Amino acid sequence: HWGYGKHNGPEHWHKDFPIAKGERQSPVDIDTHTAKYDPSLKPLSVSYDQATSLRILNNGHAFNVEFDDSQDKAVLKGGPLDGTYRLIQFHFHWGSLDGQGSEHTVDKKKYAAELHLVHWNTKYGDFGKAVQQPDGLAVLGIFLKVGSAKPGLQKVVDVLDSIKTKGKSADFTNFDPRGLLPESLDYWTYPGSLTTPPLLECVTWIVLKEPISVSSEQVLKFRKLNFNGEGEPEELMVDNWRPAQPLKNRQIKASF
Numbered sequence: 663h664w665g666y667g668k669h670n671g672p673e674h675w676h677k678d679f680p681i682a683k684g685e686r687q688s689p690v691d692i693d694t695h696t697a698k699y700d701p702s703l704k705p706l707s708v709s710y711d712q713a714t715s716l717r718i719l720n721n722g723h724a725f726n727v728e729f730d731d732s733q734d735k736a737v738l739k740g741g742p743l744d745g746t747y748r749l750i751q752f753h754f755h756w757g758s759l760d761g762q763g764s765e766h767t768v769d770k771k772k773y774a775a776e777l778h779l780v781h782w783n784t785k786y787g788d789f790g791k792a793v794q795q796p797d798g799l800a801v802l803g804i805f806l807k808v809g810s811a812k813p814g815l816q817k818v819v820d821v822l823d824s825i826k827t828k829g830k831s832a833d834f835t836n837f838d839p840r841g842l843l844p845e846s847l848d849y850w851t852y853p854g855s856l857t858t859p860p861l862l863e864c865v866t867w868i869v870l871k872e873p874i875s876v877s878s879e880q881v882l883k884f885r886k887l888n889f890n891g892e893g894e895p896e897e898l899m900v901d902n903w904r905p906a907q908p909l910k911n912r913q914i915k916a917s918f
């Protein structure tokens with residue numbers, strides 16, 4: 663199936679998922695000088711106080727930290743959003759080198775990784791129904807640059823040994839995602855899609871201007887993960903990012 667290899671990577675996805683060449687695909691390059699400041703954009707409201715993390719899983723494409731989304735515990739609202747969006751999971755995209763790894767780029771600059779906090783619109787009842795709507799998901803994207811260590815990321819880094827291969831999972835309770843946020847909530851926003859198959863155009867993207875800093879040791883551990891399952895040839899889970907797609911008929915708005 664699809665992946666990030668030379669034979670099944672992003673350039674091949676359109677064959678099984680034609681929407682790959684759609685009108686509102688993600689990620690995109692954020693041209694800071696062309697983005698339009700929108701004074702009507704409200705401040706973001708991130709309420710992760712009652713977040714309930716459950717487990718961490720290696721799904722063969724990335725590792726996801728999953729949350730209990732049966733109630734409005736951890737939610738995103740405000741900004742360009744209308745309604746309440748519940749946090750269901752977060753994961754990252756990273757490179758084989760510090761010079762690449764992010765999906766979105768800023769003035770063509772690639773960051774070492776990119777965190778995606780995925781939320782779905784409660785007006786649609788469940789995640790499955792939400793992905794079928796143009797405003798079904800809200801994904802908060804946060805860039806990672808290599809520098810000082812990120813304390814709030816260490817609990818994640820330390821459990822990676824227990825989910826090295828595809829299909830592995832581990833309990834991951836009491837993890838506070840607030841420890842992954844930068845100081846500033848200034849952001850760019852635009853309508854887009856999932857960056858992985860099925861590439862549905864159901865995402866309101868909110869990308870934070872301020873990256874978080876992580877250490878070389880922390881990102882290096884991400885690169886020790888495996889795309890393959892136990893008992894199969896080892897394939898290092900690196901460069902699980904889709905390159906920037908055509909902006910087409912869209913305008914990126916800035917909150918600042």
Ligand SMILES: O[B-]1(O)OCc2ccc(NC(=S)NCc3ccccc3)cc21
Binds near residue numbers: 793856
């Ligand atoms: O492209 B991304 O890595 O970035 C942002 C993002 C958000 C959600 C996902 N997909 C999830 S939670 N399930 C897969 C699925 C989705 C829709 C239908 C079937 C199956 C992947 C990504």
Ligand SMILES: [Zn+2]
Binds near residue numbers: 754755
């Ligand atoms: Zn993602």
